[PDB]
Amino acid sequence: SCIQFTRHASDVLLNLNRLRSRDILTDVVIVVSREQFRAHKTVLMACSGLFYSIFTDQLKCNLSVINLDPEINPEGFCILLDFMYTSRLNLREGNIMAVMATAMYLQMEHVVDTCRKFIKAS
Amino acid sequence: SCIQFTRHASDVLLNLNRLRSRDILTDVVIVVSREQFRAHKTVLMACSGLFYSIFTDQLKCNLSVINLDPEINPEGFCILLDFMYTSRLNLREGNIMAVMATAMYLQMEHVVDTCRKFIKAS
Amino acid sequence: SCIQFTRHASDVLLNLNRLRSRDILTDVVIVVSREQFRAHKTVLMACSGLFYSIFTDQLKCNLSVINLDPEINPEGFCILLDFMYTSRLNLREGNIMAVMATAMYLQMEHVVDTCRKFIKAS
Amino acid sequence: SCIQFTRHASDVLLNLNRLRSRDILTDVVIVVSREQFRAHKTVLMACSGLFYSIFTDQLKCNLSVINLDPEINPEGFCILLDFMYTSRLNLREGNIMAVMATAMYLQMEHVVDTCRKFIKAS
Amino acid sequence: SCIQFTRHASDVLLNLNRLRSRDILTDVVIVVSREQFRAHKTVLMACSGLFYSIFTDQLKCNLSVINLDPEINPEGFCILLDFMYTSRLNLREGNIMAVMATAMYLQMEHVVDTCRKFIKAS
Amino acid sequence: SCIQFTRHASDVLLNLNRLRSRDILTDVVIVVSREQFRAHKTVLMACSGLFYSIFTDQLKCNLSVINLDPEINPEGFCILLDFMYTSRLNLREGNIMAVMATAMYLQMEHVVDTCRKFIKAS
Amino acid sequence: SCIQFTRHASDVLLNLNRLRSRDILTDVVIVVSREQFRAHKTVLMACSGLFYSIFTDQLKCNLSVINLDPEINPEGFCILLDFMYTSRLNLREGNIMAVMATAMYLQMEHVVDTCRKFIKAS
């Protein structure tokens, strides 16, 4: 029928991370407490339900700056943003809770499920 | 060390295709002869060298409409655009040449290589 | 007698999906909770009994907007809409139930039967 | 990965033929010489390049009546219309030429190729 | 003596199906539950004993609309109507019973006999 | 796939001939010189191009009486009418010419072709 | 001495069938259950012993309507009536018994003998 490229998706994500690192076409600024994170809206929606709900709304599509609640832990967010573009989650006993709570706020069900298995195994 | 998500990249690409189908955050219009194709700039760069060279240039970053040469075969382009978001390439004896030529124009080396293996095996 | 084209139907469905992706002649908008899905009435009737019962009625034939119950899970619907145009069903343990319930609401007996075999085998 | 439905496409085409027979959602009238044929625009585009080129144009999308050249043989057209919805082509020595010429006008490359093999074998 | 045309009857039936598809001289409307089916009275009598008994009666000859019992399964009827004009019966495990029961109601002894052999072999 | 009934079409034609013999639902009177022939419009169209062209016209659909040119030989017409309902053509050296000429007038190409082969072999 | 016409009798029977089909000089109506059959008294006597015994009687000669017992199967009678005028008997496993019984009632010894050989060979 057709031909399946097993590593295509990983190559795409890698190139997207390269563009993000170089600030190419990063159309949104995420403000967490005092920190700023530039990212691509499409990747945020693809990996986050909260960002999906926000950017799906035509009233918040064109929003250049997204101000999250100051309560969200920056370490939970930046670890998760790196994971979103790399698929590698830096989960350790010192940040597991901040990450789990942030994944809950960002509606990353599979991430929360893995934080649940993490403290279940540890 | 860390945990590898084998199917994360495919889930990301699938959600990106869902956004494209729903016209969510599609910031560019590709004009091929008389046809129009809305897509995401980041995915185009991630999968195409030509689009990478174009959108890497700060002069052509913010271009909302990209007019390709009218010589480019639309079937080669739309099959390739679907493959870019799905990783499945609809290559058949009736379109192999249009696809190979378009992949050459779009600088999709692995696609051209597979078109080479296709007619080599057929 | 005559000549059977084994791959004709798949080529037809593929071209129909290409038109849907390009919003060509999509005459209906399906409203699920807050999401909108544009599709072709004929394909919906061809693959769904509920849509068949609706569009068969001359009172609901010309309805441009179909508002489904807000209870229907969007993931069940969009996975099923893609399957309707592609014949490929993305059934995984995380969405099997939403899909089974939606196929029941949409009256997709063979889909419900396959969801039954899925959890029977898993 | 996923589950392939080998007979789904045939069931879809069969239901589409059932709707056409019952005049359900047939949005176009094809006028060939003195004869009228009601069909679905999406199926016509899916199986015909000429109808694809016509209905792809936004100026001819909403055309309810398509007047073909009076030179087109009705037997070539109706045999082909039935084949489009059934995948069964009624090709016999008495109509092969009218069908081949009509498939050429309708841009049905695989049909013309089969008419070529027909007189090549007969 | 004379000359036998082996394929004449099939050509006649095919042309009759073409007229039915084009609604030419279809003088009767069959109402099954909420569905309507236009057909030719002569073909119905030729293939059905029930319709023979009905249309043989001079009181029900000129009846333009025939209302069958709402209990008759539409899939059994439409599959059988297509078979009546095509000689091809779409009998599968999912509809065998509806077809057998409808053939019994329509008095299609050979069809019922084949439904008997179907479940006997399956 | 499905089941082919090799003798269904012959059984249908036989029952149609039985109805014609019993004057059941014969909706048209064919006037040839001084003779009258009652037949079914659908069978006439199915077997004759002239009757197809006539009854296809909505102006001549509902015509209860069809007056043919008085020049048409009645033996050519009645032999052909019997053949139309029986598939058996009574072609002999004494009537071959009247039949060939009538088949030409009625546009029965295969009949004319067989009259051509008849005098070619005799 | 004289000249024997081998095919005269068949030509006579054929013309008699043509008159019967056109209702010319058919002086009797045979009522079988709810069905009516118009035929010629002379042919009935020539081929049937029962009709011979009836029409030989001067009391039943001029009877315009002959009411047979409602028990006689119409398929046995009409197949036999066609055979009487055509010499071709449509004997199949589905009607052999109705025909044999009717030939017995009509006193068609050679027909009953052939029904005996039929089930003897089958």
Added chain:
Amino acid sequence: SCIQFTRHASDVLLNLNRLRSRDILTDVVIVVSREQFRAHKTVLMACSGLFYSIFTDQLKCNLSVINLDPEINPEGFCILLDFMYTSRLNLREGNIMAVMATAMYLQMEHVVDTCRKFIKAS
């Protein structure tokens, strides 16, 4: 398919001759000069074109007495009437001309043709 009775037609004609000899159901009187001949209308039409043209007319159907022109030779007529019921023509040099002329008047083309071959061979 079916079974052909080679001698059925001769047995029918023989029984018809037996009825004529016994004056059973002879519904017409043919008056030739001073002679009277009782026969069956159906046999006359079956073997004679003149009688066919006469009895086909509804005005002359029910005529109990048919007065032929007094010029018609009785020997030509009675020889022909016997031949009509027996298929044996008593043609001898002393009556050939009266028979040929009568067959011409009665429109018995094959009889006239045989009278032509008779004097051609003698």
